[PDB]
Amino acid sequence: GGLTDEAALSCCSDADPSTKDFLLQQTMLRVKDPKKSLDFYTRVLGMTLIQKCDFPIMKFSLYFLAYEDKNDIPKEKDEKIAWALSRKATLELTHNWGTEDDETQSYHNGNSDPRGFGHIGIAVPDVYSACKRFEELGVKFVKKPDDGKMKGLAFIQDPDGYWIEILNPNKMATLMLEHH
Amino acid sequence: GGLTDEAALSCCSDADPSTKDFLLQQTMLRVKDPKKSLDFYTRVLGMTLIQKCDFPIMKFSLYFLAYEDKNDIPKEKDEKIAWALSRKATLELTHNWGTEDDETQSYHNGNSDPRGFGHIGIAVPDVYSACKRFEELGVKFVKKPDDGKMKGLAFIQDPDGYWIEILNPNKMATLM
Numbered sequence: 480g481g482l483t484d485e486a487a488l489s490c491c492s493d494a495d496p497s498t499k500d501f502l503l504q505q506t507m508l509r510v511k512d513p514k515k516s517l518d519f520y521t522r523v524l525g526m527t528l529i530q531k532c533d534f535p536i537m538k539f540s541l542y543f544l545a546y547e548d549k550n551d552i553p554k555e556k557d558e559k560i561a562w563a564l565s566r567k568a569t570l571e572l573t574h575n576w577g578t579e580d581d582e583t584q585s586y587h588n589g590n591s592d593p594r595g596f597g598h599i600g601i602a603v604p605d606v607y608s609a610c611k612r613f614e615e616l617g618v619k620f621v622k623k624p625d626d627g628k629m630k631g632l633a634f635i636q637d638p639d640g641y642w643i644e645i646l647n648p649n650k651m652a653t654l655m656l657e658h659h
Numbered sequence: 660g661g662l663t664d665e666a667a668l669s670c671c672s673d674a675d676p677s678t679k680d681f682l683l684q685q686t687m688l689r690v691k692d693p694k695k696s697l698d699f700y701t702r703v704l705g706m707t708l709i710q711k712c713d714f715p716i717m718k719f720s721l722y723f724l725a726y727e728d729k730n731d732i733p734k735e736k737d738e739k740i741a742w743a744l745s746r747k748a749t750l751e752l753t754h755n756w757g758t759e760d761d762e763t764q765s766y767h768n769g770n771s772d773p774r775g776f777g778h779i780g781i782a783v784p785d786v787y788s789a790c791k792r793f794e795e796l797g798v799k800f801v802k803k804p805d806d807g808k809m810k811g812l813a814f815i816q817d818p819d820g821y822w823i824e825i826l827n828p829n830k831m832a833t834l835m
């Protein structure tokens with residue numbers, strides 16, 4: 480089952496010139512409580528809030544998190560928007576006003592029925608170290624580095640239960656135990 | 660209301676030094692049919708397949724797609740994986756083998772109950788020209804550039820029904 484390498488490549492086309500400056504700018508998740516979300520993504524994972532927007536008829540706010548240096552963030556409202564939404568690899572967290580105060584409300588993380596979305600993933604230079612810190616800080620784990628067969632790979636959860644892969648690019652080649 | 664700006668910022672902490680080289684490397688979506696998915700992300704959206712991984716015991720494959728020049732992919736296999744999984748803003752598409760032939764299976768896009776995930780988003784130089792190309796290619800639209808209040812912002816759907824935003828950053832800088 481599954482495609483061969485060749486069959487997969489036969490389904491691929493070269494990038495049309497019209498697409499040549501496109502970039503993958505954002506991944507959007509719904510959040511129940513932006514206070515807890517901002518504290519997790521900034522304090523625990525070290526991202527930076529680069530932009531926020533509010534839509535009062537709609538009754539929602541948008542928050543833009545990214546691994547960016549806060550010094551590079553423009554001060555002028557208009558320029559900041561242009562800068563923020565032209566960064567690669569942002570996380571857009573949507574808050575529907577009111578969710579934080581409903582005890583039962585929760586978003587679905589995509590990993591139980593009905594499945595779809597699986598996770599976001601953060602490349603780190605040392606999974607083991609980063610995960611000792613997450614433990615120290617009380618983060619919830621789906622999978623700790625040495626649980627199951629894929630070693631030196633972890634999954635944690637944000638305050639909504641969305642899964643975050645924690646990986647080391649250099650270990651991905653050799654995930655499984657080897658020579659042994 | 661929700662939070663003021665000042666409040667929101669009050670909830671943010673400075674980066675712990677240990678997190679300084681962290682990067683948002685991937686967003687994983689599961690896909691029914693990798694053939695149609697690969698065709699959509701490469702031909703319609705102009706991404707590149709940078710890594711394919713197969714796990715026959717577990718019966719799934721992973722396809723890493725990114726806006727990268729195909730001439731920068733390493734030739735050697737361990738180097739290519741390290742490079743691919745060190746790129747920012749990749750899309751990981753997971754194919755559980757057999758879904759492509761299953762008439763009743765489909766994945767949920769996160770935008771009907773139960774909701775969670777909403778969309779990925781592509782920044783483009785010009786939303787109107789991008790979407791006119793997308794329409795000529797038969798792409799299915801959830802929101803056309805000028806439908807509703809937010810003009811020059813569009814939403815299309817991939818073969819599984821995931822929503823993809825099409826935005827122009829230089830022009831939200833002339834909107835509220």
Ligand SMILES: Oc1cc(O)cc(/C=C/c2ccc(O)c(O)c2)c1
Pocket residue numbers: 600622629634644646651685721744751
């Ligand atoms: O606990 C779990 C559950 C699951 O359903 C999948 C995995 C592994 C996925 C994976 C494997 C290799 C990668 O390079 C990658 O980014 C993701 C781990």
Ligand SMILES: Oc1cc(O)cc(/C=C/c2ccc(O)c(O)c2)c1
Pocket residue numbers: 505541571573777780801802809814824826831
């Ligand atoms: O069809 C949908 C569903 C949804 O849940 C949200 C939106 C759009 C809101 C939005 C508005 C401005 C932005 O810059 C952005 O990235 C997203 C569109």
Ligand SMILES: [Zn+2]
Pocket residue numbers: 505507571778780824
């Ligand atoms: Zn969005």
Ligand SMILES: [Zn+2]
Pocket residue numbers: 598600644685687751
């Ligand atoms: Zn992953």
